[PDB]
Design a protein around this ligand. Structure first.
Ligand code: ZN
Length: 40
DNA sequence: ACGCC
């Protein structure tokens, strides 16, 4: 019962911790299928 | 924030 780990487990999304996706698949995170590099 | 690998 790790109350200290209130969020950000392995189960849940690292980025935004929403619904049932993950930080691999996060729609908030700019995973644009076009090279979403810190440049363009 | 990845990754749960
Ligand atoms: Zn997310």
């Amino acid at each position: 019962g790790e109350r200290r780990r209130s969020q950000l487990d392995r189960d849940q999304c690292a980025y935004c911790k929403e619904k049932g996706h993950w930080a691999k698949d996060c729609p908030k995170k700019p995973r644009g299928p076009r090279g979403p590099r810190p440049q363009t």
